[PDB]
Amino acid sequence: PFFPPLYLGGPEITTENCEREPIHIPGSIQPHGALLTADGHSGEVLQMSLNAATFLGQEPTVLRGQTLAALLPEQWPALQAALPPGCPDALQYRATLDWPAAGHLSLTVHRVGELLILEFEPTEAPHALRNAMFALESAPNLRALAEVATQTVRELTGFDRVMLYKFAPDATGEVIAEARREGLHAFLGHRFPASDIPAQARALYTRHLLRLTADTRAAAVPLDPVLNPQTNAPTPLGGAVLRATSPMHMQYLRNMGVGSSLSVSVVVGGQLWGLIACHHQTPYVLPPDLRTTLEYLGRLLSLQVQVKEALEH
Amino acid sequence: DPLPFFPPLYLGGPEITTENCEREPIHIPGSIQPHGALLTADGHSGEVLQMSLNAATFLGQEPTVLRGQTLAALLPEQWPALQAALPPGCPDALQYRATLDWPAAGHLSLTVHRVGELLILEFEPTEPHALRNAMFALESAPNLRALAEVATQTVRELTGFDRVMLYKFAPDATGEVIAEARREGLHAFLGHRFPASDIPAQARALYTRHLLRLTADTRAAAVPLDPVLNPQTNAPTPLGGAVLRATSPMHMQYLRNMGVGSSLSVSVVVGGQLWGLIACHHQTPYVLPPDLRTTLEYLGRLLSLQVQVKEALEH
Ligand SMILES: *C/C=C1/C(=C/c2[nH]c(/C=C3[NH+]=C(/C=C4\NC(=O)C(C=C)=C4C)C(C)=C\3CCC(=O)O)c(CCC(=O)O)c2C)NC(=O)[C@H]1C
Numbered sequence: 001p002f003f004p005p006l007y008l009g010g011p012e013i014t015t016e017n018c019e020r021e022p023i024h025i026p027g028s029i030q031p032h033g034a035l036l037t038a039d040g041h042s043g044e045v046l047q048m049s050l051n052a053a054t055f056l057g058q059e060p061t062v063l064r065g066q067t068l069a070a071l072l073p074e075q076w077p078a079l080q081a082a083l084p085p086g087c088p089d090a091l092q093y094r095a096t097l098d099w100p101a102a103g104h105l106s107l108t109v110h111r112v113g114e115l116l117i118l119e120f121e122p123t124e125a126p127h128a129l130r131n132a133m134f135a136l137e138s139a140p141n142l143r144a145l146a147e148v149a150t151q152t153v154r155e156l157t158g159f160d161r162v163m164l165y166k167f168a169p170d171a172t173g174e175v176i177a178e179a180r181r182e183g184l185h186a187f188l189g190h191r192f193p194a195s196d197i198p199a200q201a202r203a204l205y206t207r208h209l210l211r212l213t214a215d216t217r218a219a220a221v222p223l224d225p226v227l228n229p230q231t232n233a234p235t236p237l238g239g240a241v242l243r244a245t246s247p248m249h250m251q252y253l254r255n256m257g258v259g260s261s262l263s264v265s266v267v268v269g270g271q272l273w274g275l276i277a278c279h280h281q282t283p284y285v286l287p288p289d290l291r292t293t294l295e296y297l298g299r300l301l302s303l304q305v306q307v308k309e310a311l312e313h
Numbered sequence: 314d315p316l317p318f319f320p321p322l323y324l325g326g327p328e329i330t331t332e333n334c335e336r337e338p339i340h341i342p343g344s345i346q347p348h349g350a351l352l353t354a355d356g357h358s359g360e361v362l363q364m365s366l367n368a369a370t371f372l373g374q375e376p377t378v379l380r381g382q383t384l385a386a387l388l389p390e391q392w393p394a395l396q397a398a399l400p401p402g403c404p405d406a407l408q409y410r411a412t413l414d415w416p417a418a419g420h421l422s423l424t425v426h427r428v429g430e431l432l433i434l435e436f437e438p439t440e441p442h443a444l445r446n447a448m449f450a451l452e453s454a455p456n457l458r459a460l461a462e463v464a465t466q467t468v469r470e471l472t473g474f475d476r477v478m479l480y481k482f483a484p485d486a487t488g489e490v491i492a493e494a495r496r497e498g499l500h501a502f503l504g505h506r507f508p509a510s511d512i513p514a515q516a517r518a519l520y521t522r523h524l525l526r527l528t529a530d531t532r533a534a535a536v537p538l539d540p541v542l543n544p545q546t547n548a549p550t551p552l553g554g555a556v557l558r559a560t561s562p563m564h565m566q567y568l569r570n571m572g573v574g575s576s577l578s579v580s581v582v583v584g585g586q587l588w589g590l591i592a593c594h595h596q597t598p599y600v601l602p603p604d605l606r607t608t609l610e611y612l613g614r615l616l617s618l619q620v621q622v623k624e625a626l627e628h
């Protein structure tokens with residue numbers, strides 16, 4: 001099963017109970033964005049991140065009464081149609097708001113049962129993606145495909161280190177390709193145990209395909225209330241990319257000397273084949289539109305891995 | 314019966330009838346569609362060899378001036394990028410794309426690929442979260458039918474085409490329309506089937522390697538290359554990788570007879586085989602700009618993946 005989260009007086013996490021940390025319900029988010037939850041029917045704002053006032057420019061109480069209808073007039077019917085009751089928690093809808101306080105915000109919404117989860121992040125506003133797609137497809141074998149993928153991602157993102165991390169049948173991981181800035185250690189060829197990416201995180205990574213830590217020294221921002229009014233239970237944040245990263249996992253990034261980290265799931269035959277895994281030495285908020293490019297690349301790599309593995313077997 | 318290609322018309326080959334369908338060398342027509350321009354150049358020196366006859370009007374230069382310069386001089390910023398992206402021996406399927414600001418012609422999209430020692434350069438005029446939203450909707454579709462319907466509707470919304478069909482191949486290479494989105498008033502093609510020589514054998518092979526092709530105006534005359542043969546080889550210039558390549562006159566008559574002014578299609582490739590086609594019709598001529606066509610190319614790949622996934626959920 002899982003332990004209760006901390007804020008419901010559950011046990012603190014060790015290297016003895018790695019598998020039972022409830023990574024999906026931390027009750028908090030990373031501070032480079034803001035999150036609201038809301039009722040599926042009424043559009044009634046039920047929870048907000050204590051930092052919402054910053055991003056939205058709204059007097060705190062104003063929000064926690066109001067309706068999405070009021071708050072987001074153009075958007076609220078689109079949401080209603082895009083995310084019908086009963087849809088999967090994996091389905092997401094995005095829009096760009098030109099919002100008074102903040103030039104442009106990206107809005108990302110998904111639905112978990114009766115709750116809409118809304119994420120707001122700063123945003124903005126060429127051929128590198130098309131060029132990359134063809135490059136991946138003409139790679140002659142899996143090894144070269146891995147090399148092209150890591151190089152392409154590094155060029156698109158500027159990340160200090162991009163790796164392709166492949167899982168063995170026992171969930172033992174191996175860095176099979178790597179693109180990195182001059183003057184970093186080389187993780188190429190190294191294997192790491194299966195507990196370094198524990199079972200409950202690999203399951204989540206099979207369904208929700210992109211996650212990040214923007215700053216491995218930043219404090220999480222609580223949800224208020226912490227419990228969902230609807231249920232008097234924890235809000236599932238598994239499908240939110242603003243969800244706080246497990247402190248057990250940020251301690252392992254800090255000990256490695258990484259200040260920023262992103263990964264994309266490569267999913268083949270319904271299973272987690274491997275990860276595009278990115279490091280930055282310093283804090284780094286990759287903007288939403290560039291993340292989208294990596295999300296596309298994730299799908300394309302999933303296709304090409306199968307194609308390429310089929311021409312060996 | 315499968316038989317080798319006839320020589321093209323310009324090398325004294327025969328004219329194409331319903332008898333010799335499968336033998337038209339559709340990859341070497343010696344000509345392009347008039348909404349863009351094409352140059353060929355030597356892959357090592359960058360000497361310009363062939364150009365479409367309309368090139369002066371896209372590029373704003375006399376032929377003899379174009380042909381008298383190397384790509385190093387014509388494309389000083391792109392020439393080194395081309396050479397890195399398209400190394401000798403690379404496959405003909407690999408494409409490099411850039412946007413140019415050309416004085417006379419505005420923003421041009423440049424698409425380049427390499428066939429042996431030849432570079433092929435295509436120039437076309439070029440111009441929010443719809444793709445991301447579509448990607449997730451496709452993935453959440455519960456079964457093959459719902460996927461097919463979401464895919465057709467999405468493509469129609471992105472493009473404005475009068476008709477978008479998912480056209481699936483059977484094992485005998487007959488095809489059937491299994492989903493479609495269509496303009497009000499058009500008759501349905503849903504569930505109709507069509508014989509295997511409707512898209513014959515030398516076109517299905519080409520459609521497994523080069524995944525997008527189009528006919529922007531089913532009545533437009535093709536524009537010859539000049540000279541027609543590659544001076545490197547005194548042989549035909551391979552154009553199967555060029556979206557500008559003229560369409561078969563037999564295929565253009567087939568669309569005209571259906572009342573179609575513009576046709577486009579994307580290949581859906583599963584396990585190395587052509588599974589189907591995203592097929593679009595418009596009743597009037599219609600040019601879809603290169604950046605919009607890129608969205609369809611990306612959806613072609615997504616759909617190939619999702620078709621595998623939906624079919625595996627099915628035994
Ligand atoms: C007590 C459990 C431990 C643990 C937990 C844990 N790990 C993740 C996610 C990841 N761990 C990774 C480990 C590595 N990073 C590397 O660079 C290498 C090798 C070169 C390894 C082996 C990776 C890559 C991930 C994926 C996420 C990412 O890329 O940022 C989680 C889930 C965290 C979350 O969802 O927020 C958890 C709970 N990690 C351990 O090492 C042990 C001590």
Ligand SMILES: *C/C=C1/C(=C/c2[nH]c(/C=C3[NH+]=C(/C=C4\NC(=O)C(C=C)=C4C)C(C)=C\3CCC(=O)O)c(CCC(=O)O)c2C)NC(=O)[C@H]1C
Pocket residue numbers: 330331332333334335337339488490502507508510511512513516526559560561563564567576577578592593
């Ligand atoms: C003897 C010659 C024949 C012939 C040749 C031919 N056909 C193609 C390509 C296509 N034919 C298609 C036929 C259909 N269009 C539809 O709308 C339906 C059903 C609803 C069918 C069955 C299609 C869809 C294509 C693909 C191109 C496109 O999407 O428009 C070629 C190759 C063209 C080229 O590469 O330039 C050739 C040579 N087809 C015949 O029926 C006979 C007359």
